[PDB]
Amino acid sequence: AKAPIRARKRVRKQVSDGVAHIHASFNNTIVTITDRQGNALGWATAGGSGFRGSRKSTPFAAQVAAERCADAVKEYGIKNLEVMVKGPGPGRESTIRALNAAGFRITNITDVTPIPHNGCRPPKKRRV
Amino acid sequence: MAKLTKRMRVIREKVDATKQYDINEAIALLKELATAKFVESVDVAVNLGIDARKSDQNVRGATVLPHGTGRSVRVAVFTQGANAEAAKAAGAELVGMEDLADQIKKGEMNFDVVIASPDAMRVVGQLGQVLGPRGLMPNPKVGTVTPNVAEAVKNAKAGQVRYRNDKNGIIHTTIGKVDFDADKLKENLEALLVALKKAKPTQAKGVYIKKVSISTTMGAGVAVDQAGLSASVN
RNA sequence: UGAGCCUUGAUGUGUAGGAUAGGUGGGAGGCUUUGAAGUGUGGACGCCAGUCUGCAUGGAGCCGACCUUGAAAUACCACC
């Protein structure tokens, strides 16, 4: 018997299709790919992609989180996305651009930021 | 008991159960279960209560049986140190090293004994090989050689067989041709059970014989009842 | 849904090779249900020339040992 192959001969899912849900938050950015029924399949973040507090809130840190999230679902054999966005953070387009350029297929962009009919009293920070 | 491949199937249409017979009906069925165009040699398989997995602690030796075995009594000796001419004159058909390795790898493979001297055994099994470890070759690891070539051939030409195991509870040995009667077979079995008790290793059981079966070459096996000389409760 | 016991089909450590020399021993081109050879080709497994499997197909035919990996063999059995 010879030595085994350098790369796998088989793979346990091949689900082809999903949705990238982004929460581009005011201090971070969090990216998660979920199947079309909303059960999450794999994820990655700004801050977990080698950036601390001081850097994790930037579109450049988010851009790398999107690539790390494309790699996170790589094994499920998904390639096709459409995109949903929430939060004030800048992780909202640099993400999509590096996602589509990291061998995945972007197809639709829709916002899913929740807005109220007035609602409850907002917090105050720094007397703002 | 039949084995399946796409390349040879003929044993499948000769047996249809894993079942055990008295010896007077086991050979009656086995004369049917021959598949080859030539009339086949018949073997026992002697399954053992042995727990050895080290080659030196498994059974090893040889013996002469009261009746024939369908083995050829053509005898060969590998030697480059020991008395070649005294071996040939003692009744060996073949002596050499240069083309004995090819002769065993050609024609009919039906040798009764392939001997080496330890003078040549170096290139027969250990550092060199000439057929690979198999019963047809003298075994690279267990004691199958002597520098008394002229004695070893004189024992061999009597229709003596060879038994050993290595990691499994197995002695397979030829016992006749399939035309044999169940008394000739039982009488060679009782002779061999003496000779396995006399060459018994420390790591074998009280119940030294697990099961016994009879099997022809190209053809199938059937199982037999007999295990004789080896009950523990006396 | 976990484990064992068991029977069988599949599976094989000496590395390399196209690959797959587990042990032991016997033996060598074989039918009665099937087909391998070989040509072509789908499946599965794998190392990329391989093995396991099937169909067109031979079915009184045909692959070993030459060839080839290696110090060394290799139709094809039974036993564990």
From Swiss-Prot, chain A:
Gene3D superfamilies: Ribosomal protein S11
Signal sequence residues: none
This protein's record includes keyword Transmembrane helix: no
InterPro entries in UniProt: Ribosomal_uS11, Ribosomal_uS11_bac-type, Ribosomal_uS11_CS, Ribosomal_uS11_sf
Modified residues (N-methylalanine): 1
Gene Ontology terms: biological process: cytoplasmic translation; translation
Cellular component terms (Gene Ontology): cytoplasm; cytosol; cytosolic small ribosomal subunit
GO terms for MF: small ribosomal subunit rRNA binding; structural constituent of ribosome
Alphabetically ordered keywords of this record: Methylation, Ribonucleoprotein, Ribosomal protein, RNA-binding, rRNA-binding
NCBIfam families hit by this protein: PRK05309.1, uS11_bact
Family: Belongs to the universal ribosomal protein uS11 family.
Misc. remarks from the entry: Has been predicted to contact the N-terminal domain of IF-3 based on footprint studies; exactly how IF-3 interacts with the 30S subunit is controversial.
Self-association and partners: Part of the 30S ribosomal subunit. Interacts with proteins uS7 and bS18. Cross-links to IF-3. In stalled ribosomes contacts ribosome rescue factor SmrB.
Protein task: Located on the platform of the 30S subunit, it bridges several disparate RNA helices of the 16S rRNA. Forms part of the Shine-Dalgarno cleft in the 70S ribosome.
Protein name in the entry: Small ribosomal subunit protein uS11
Organism annotation: Escherichia coli (strain K12)
UniProtKB/Swiss-Prot annotation, chain B:
GO biological process terms held by the UniProt record: cytoplasmic translation; negative regulation of translational initiation; ribosomal large subunit assembly
Residue positions where N6-succinyllysine is found in the record: 105, 154, 186, 197
SUPFAM superfamilies: Ribosomal protein L1
CDD domains per UniProt: Ribosomal_L1
One Gene Ontology term, aspect cellular component: cytosol
Record carries keyword Kinase: no
One protein family per Pfam: Ribosomal_L1
Record bears the keyword Disulfide bond: no
Single GO MF descriptor: tRNA binding
Keywords: Repressor, Ribonucleoprotein, Ribosomal protein, RNA-binding, rRNA-binding, Translation regulation, tRNA-binding
Secretion signal span: none
InterPro entries per the UniProt record, alphabetical: Ribosom_uL1_bac-type, Ribosomal_uL1, Ribosomal_uL1-like, Ribosomal_uL1/biogenesis, Ribosomal_uL1_3-a/b-sand, Ribosomal_uL1_CS
Gene3D superfamilies to which the protein is assigned, alphabetical: 3.30.190.20, 3.40.50.790
Quaternary structure and partners: Part of the 50S ribosomal subunit. Cross-links to the P and E site tRNAs.
Family recorded in the similarity comment: Belongs to the universal ribosomal protein uL1 family.
Role description: One of the primary rRNA binding proteins, it binds very close to the 3'-end of the 23S rRNA. Forms part of the L1 stalk. It is often not seen in high-resolution crystal structures, but can be seen in cryo_EM and 3D reconstruction models. These indicate that the distal end of the stalk moves by approximately 20 angstroms. This stalk movement is thought to be coupled to movement of deacylated tRNA into and out of the E site, and thus to participate in tRNA translocation. Contacts the P and E site tRNAs.
Protein name: Large ribosomal subunit protein uL1
Classification lineage: Bacteria, Pseudomonadati, Pseudomonadota, Gammaproteobacteria, Enterobacterales
Gene expressing this chain: rplA
